[PDB]
Curated annotation (Swiss-Prot), chains D, E:
Name of the featured protein: Capsid protein VP4
PTM section of the record: Myristoylation is required during RNA encapsidation and formation of the mature virus particle.
Organism: Foot-and-mouth disease virus (strain A10/Holland/1961 serotype A)
Tree of life domain: Viruses
Its job: Lies on the inner surface of the capsid shell. After binding to the host receptor, the capsid undergoes conformational changes. Capsid protein VP4 is released, capsid protein VP1 N-terminus is externalized, and together, they shape a pore in the host membrane through which the viral genome is translocated into the host cell cytoplasm. After genome has been released, the channel shrinks.
Amino acid sequence: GIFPVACADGYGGLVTTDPKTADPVYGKVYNPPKTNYPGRFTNLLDVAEACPTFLRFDDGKPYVVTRADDTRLLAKFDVSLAAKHMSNTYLSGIAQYYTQYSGTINLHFMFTGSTDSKARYMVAYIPPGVETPPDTPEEAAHCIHAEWDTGLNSKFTFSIPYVSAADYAYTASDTAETTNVQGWVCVYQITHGKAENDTLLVSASAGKDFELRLPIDPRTQ
Amino acid sequence: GIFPVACADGYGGLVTTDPKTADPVYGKVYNPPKTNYPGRFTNLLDVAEACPTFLRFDDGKPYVVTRADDTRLLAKFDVSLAAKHMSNTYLSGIAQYYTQYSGTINLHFMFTGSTDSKARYMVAYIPPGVETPPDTPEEAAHCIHAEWDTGLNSKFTFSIPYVSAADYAYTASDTAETTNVQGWVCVYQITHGKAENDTLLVSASAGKDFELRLPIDPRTQ
Amino acid sequence: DRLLTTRNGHTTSTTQSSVGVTYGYSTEEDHVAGPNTSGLETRVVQAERFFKKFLFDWTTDKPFGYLTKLELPTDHHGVFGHLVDSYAYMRNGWDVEVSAVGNQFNGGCLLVAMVPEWKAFDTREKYQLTLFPHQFISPRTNMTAHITVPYLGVNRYDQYKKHKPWTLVVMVLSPLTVSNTAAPQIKVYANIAPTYVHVAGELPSKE
Amino acid sequence: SGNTGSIINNYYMQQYQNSMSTQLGTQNNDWFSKLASSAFTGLFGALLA
Amino acid sequence: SGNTGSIINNYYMQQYQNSMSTQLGTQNNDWFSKLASSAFTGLFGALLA
Amino acid sequence: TTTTGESADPVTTTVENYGGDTQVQRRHHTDVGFIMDRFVKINSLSPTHVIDLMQTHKHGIVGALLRAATYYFSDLEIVVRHDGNLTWVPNGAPEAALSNTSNPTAYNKAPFTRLALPYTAPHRVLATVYDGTNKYSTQLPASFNYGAIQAQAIHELLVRMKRAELYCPRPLLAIKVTSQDRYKQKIIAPA
Amino acid sequence: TTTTGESADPVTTTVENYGGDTQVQRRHHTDVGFIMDRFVKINSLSPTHVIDLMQTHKHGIVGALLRAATYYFSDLEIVVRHDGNLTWVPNGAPEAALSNTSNPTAYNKAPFTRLALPYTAPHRVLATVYDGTNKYSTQLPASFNYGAIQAQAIHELLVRMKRAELYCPRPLLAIKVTSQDRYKQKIIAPA
């Protein structure tokens, strides 16, 4: 006799993300050596961490300009990988292919001013729960925030904390979403001395515990 | 119960080069002994190395004739297994069944002249990059080349080096290919004394590191 | 004192406002002796030295995104150039140094990067140009950028006359700002030197 | 491996299932991994907590 | 073998899968292999490098 | 943390700077090998088709990701829904070979055909972009392919990168945002 | 390297003669056993067909290669697409036997039939060419066959040489070239 076997209904169909392998047909090919080829990367986040990219402001510039007027709120944006300001970053470029995330996102501010341009800035994370972000450093001061001044060192880095009810969050934003689900980031200018027209470049990168899960192919094709 | 099994879509079709074996039906046949039958060969290249065959020149002769006039370029040809001159060699005979190759191809020159016919020749490998092969030994001298004279020993062997950007090369030639992708070989006649009408037989064989990969069935059937 | 002095052959260059050197993609070179050259390649050390090339004028009117590029290798009139005409195949890496000298009273910021396999960039893509080996030049901090990259590409050796693997690119990140005391404009120059020059396949004479 | 989760060993030999990679001498050549791990994490300057 | 890459042992006995070869006394009878390996590789004469 | 931004040296601060605890992360889903290891559809088709991963859609998870690298390497798997028998041929073959049966030819078996193919180019690695001044005697070298296939008709073609290796990352863009703050879209929810 | 060409002794020089390095080579693809181990189509067919590897096409990879050897040996595999049942018979059988069921007969099962057959000739080895002055009481001896097959109709016949052994190599020709320099042809390239 031979081995009895039940061919089960429901199984066997092809699934585009299945964990199997096809049967081979053209054997014994030895590839040209690619030993030690430069610039390899094995995890997207390794580059997302090492290479920060720029946010988009105003007209479409990668920086913020010091206000000469009495307004101190330099910029404000949604803490969302789908944020308009984050739309040109590599981080968002990757994020679109995942459903959820958690972790620290790092922001980098780099002053472009002249040696005689001086300033003092403040960045704050406004968690959700308030109706509108405060346009005043005084009001924002009550949030997790940091201030720093211009000097020998041009760059200042700040980590946007992951604080939410659920352990993960959506990288995308639903149309019913009125106020950003994860809050805002506000950048203020405490003061400046002869810093009119000078610039503040801001970029973003993944933090040590930034994580993306659940691959997704969402773009229109 | 019995063993559940999923018959997978996409698998099971016959493939002309598959790595399986059919089920047998006529068992127990013992063949007549063929122990030690002569002339066996297990790898094409072993014969391709041991048995050199002839190139085709002019009218369709396996040799080159010493010029009595002032021209010194005896012959020139594309370094291609699809070369016209290589069209009658066993090497090309094999090569047509493979897509790519790399390695040394060896050329053999055997003087046929009389004891009183004397000559001095030169072979050079003109790598690609130039528009047209030089018709002068003086110009060719700047390339990898070798000179040798007539004497007690009739044969002189020279290896055409494999020098290219990619690790492998196509055995075939595309129709868009203007200048031969791997360069040319030029055979010159430096001088001769009473060698008019005498012949130089040239043949080719595989070198120690000659290699063919990727079997192909390209001929019209 | 961020004083750095680089040497390539019989040529040196020293800066008193360096911000270090950025190594791109690797810190060593892949094996320069592969099968594709059989044993015929050789190193020509006489080519490993600095040559110069003007890039552009950094002026107040050039906005963010203004980009100038220089595909390497470029027209060379020294031994490197002769090599390209005498050998079918070559390979080498690049030691790049770029100067944008104005003065401490200027403002703005340039991004200098070395890009493998160039392709004109969409303006949105410019925001991510930092994924390439780079460095910045901001008057308030430095006047020189220095990047060192290895040879790379699908072929262990190349035919520079048909393909240019690396291409230097300098781009305005924040426009130049001038005052009464600053330099009116800044000329940007490049000081480049090929590294580990190797040739193969002696071409004939042109006579 | 990535996205393959078969417990059972493959039925076809490796030299048929895949192309054989060769070397001229995988390794820890992960430029970007090294790069990311080399990032400054501390704090530049004096602290007053 | 040549162009066969099944990891798993055959289900049918060898005497059914193939014909049984007999002898009267495979070996290194590879005329051409021997022939090719016997090729002169050196250089005839004196050298001046 | 302040630093000398100009040097381009990486800086990764952590929430500890202001009293937080950095957590544990698991980045399996962002592993290159894993992420590129799924099937992707090739849209343009014809009775004779030369396999070129660049025909992949530029916004598809695999296509976008592939394009965010300068050089790559991988073996391949294909799924082809075709009429008649399917014949594949390795990189470098004369188009004419596709007619011959002794080249890997899979006899029609419904519903389609799934195969495992090896990297078969002559270069140590391939590129998604190639700055050739010529490259001859947005055009990529002819040698940059995985061979070709032919059948009486080819209805579908799915391709799968096995053992992927990516090098020299380049720009990866998200949908451009016109909306004042975020790109909002209908996210699945129960009815 | 100079030598006495007349002796016909093999000479293999290497690039070291002028300063090169001879490399490593891998000749798996030119292994006889391996290369002949694929299916090849037999074009002439009929309800009763006697298996003869020489009916193979002379320019096909297997046919050409087979013909580039004087003597050979191998077992065989066949694939037959037939109507009705298929009956095979060993070398030496009376044609009449094909009608009888107790000879290996495979009952029709779609889409075709794949079998494993043994070398069944009475000679220690076969030949591709046989200089018989007669060979009786380009014609090859009747005994040079692998048996015969019969069915109501035989639509396709693929043959596969298993355990091939080739001896005494003879001429193997490439396409003749009329073109001044090389035979050029359209090589696959992406569109």
